[PDB]
Design a protein around this motif. Sequence first.
Motif, mmCIF file in Angstrom:
data_model
loop_
_atom_site.group_PDB
_atom_site.id
_atom_site.type_symbol
_atom_site.label_atom_id
_atom_site.label_comp_id
_atom_site.label_asym_id
_atom_site.label_seq_id
_atom_site.Cartn_x
_atom_site.Cartn_y
_atom_site.Cartn_z
ATOM 1 N N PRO A 27 -6.793 5.051 -1.815
ATOM 2 C CA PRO A 27 -8.051 5.044 -1.066
ATOM 3 C C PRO A 27 -9.355 4.936 -1.837
ATOM 4 O O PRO A 27 -10.415 5.176 -1.261
ATOM 5 N N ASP A 29 -10.011 2.162 -2.873
ATOM 6 C CA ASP A 29 -10.304 0.903 -2.189
ATOM 7 C C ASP A 29 -10.414 1.265 -0.692
ATOM 8 O O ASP A 29 -10.650 2.428 -0.348
ATOM 9 N N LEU A 30 -10.285 0.258 0.172
ATOM 10 C CA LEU A 30 -10.224 0.437 1.618
ATOM 11 C C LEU A 30 -11.415 1.106 2.274
ATOM 12 O O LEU A 30 -11.359 2.273 2.681
#
Length: 52
Positions: A27, A29-30
Amino acid sequence: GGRRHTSFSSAFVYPEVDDDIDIEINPADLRIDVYRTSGAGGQHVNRTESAV
RNA sequence: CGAUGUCGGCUCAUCACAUCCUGGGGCUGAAGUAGGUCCCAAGGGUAUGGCUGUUCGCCAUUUAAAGUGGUACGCGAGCUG
Ligand SMILES: [Mg+2]
Ligand SMILES: [Mg+2]
Ligand SMILES: [Mg+2]
Ligand SMILES: [Mg+2]
């Protein structure tokens, strides 16, 4: 009437050995973005930020 | 519940600082230009359009930057539907 046939055959080799599968569900990222829906359920669904 | 009218848009804003830009600095894997990060700082400024009813978002073209939120997710005894 058996005569000289020139036939071929292929022999492709490959290991196919691995144990590493990376989804990268980390997480860091995202980016998550939350907004409200179109609105058909009256006053409630237009107030609730349900969509993502 | 012998009434507290609802999203978005228009209009008019106002305050907060966890600051997008400008200002003042430390550090740098800072040579220079350009950036990354953290601290101080709210004075002012803080897009136009295509598509959707949409906020958001995607896209095109910019701009010093096109901040994040509170304010009955501001505003229908002001408007639109
Ligand atoms: Mg420099
Ligand atoms: Mg327009
Ligand atoms: Mg737009
Ligand atoms: Mg209104």
